[PDB]
Design a protein around this ligand. Structure first.
Ligand SMILES: OC[C@H]1O[C@H](OC[C@H]2O[C@@H]3O[C@H]4[C@H](O)[C@@H](O)[C@@H](O[C@H]5[C@H](O)[C@@H](O)[C@@H](O[C@H]6[C@H](O)[C@@H](O)[C@@H](O[C@H]7[C@H](O)[C@@H](O)[C@@H](O[C@H]8[C@H](O)[C@@H](O)[C@@H](O[C@H]9[C@H](O)[C@@H](O)[C@@H](O[C@H]2[C@H](O)[C@H]3O)O[C@@H]9CO)O[C@@H]8CO)O[C@@H]7CO)O[C@@H]6CO)O[C@@H]5CO)O[C@@H]4CO)[C@H](O)[C@@H](O)[C@@H]1O
Length: 82
């Protein structure tokens, strides 16, 4: 079922969390600092998920990864899990 999937945040900051449609935005999951990156490993089902980062107190998307407009009218990242 779920696919362990490495998420990487490379834009810098001190504290980085992730949330998304994968858990119906029900909480924030910490990413862990690794050199100039922050990383987490999420078990995501197959298919598309929207997600966004909470980085030093602000919601921000990864500019290197695809984006969509959510039903709130906000910009989220989009990932396709094979
Ligand atoms: O646990 C994790 C977090 O969960 C919740 O957040 C989920 C949410 O996270 C992200 O959203 C961020 C944005 O990325 C930030 O930019 C910021 O948003 C700002 C926004 O940029 C400002 O413009 C402003 O927003 C205004 C709107 O512009 C304005 O239009 C008006 O909003 C009303 C709206 O127009 C109506 O349609 C309706 O909205 C309802 C939706 O239609 C419905 O789909 C459902 O929304 C889901 C959404 O579909 C889903 O994707 C998920 O949202 C993510 C988001 O994609 C992501 O980018 O969850 C929501 C439900 O929570 O419900 C909607 C509301 O019931 O009504 C709207 C309000 O009446 O007013 C807005 C307010 O003035 O202001 C916001 C800042 O508030 O911030 C958010 C995070 O909030 C929690 O909210 C977090 O606190 C948790 O950390």
């Amino acid at each position: 079922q779920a696919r362990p999937t490495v998420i990487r945040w490379s834009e810098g900051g001190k504290e980085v969390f992730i949330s998304g449609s994968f858990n119906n935005w029900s909480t924030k999951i910490p990413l862990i600092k690794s050199h100039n990156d922050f990383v987490a490993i999420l078990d995501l089902p197959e298919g598309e998920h929207q997600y966004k980062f909470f980085v030093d107190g602000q919601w921000v998307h990864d500019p290197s990864e695809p984006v969509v407009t959510s039903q709130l009218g906000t910009i989220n990242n989009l990932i396709h899990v094979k």
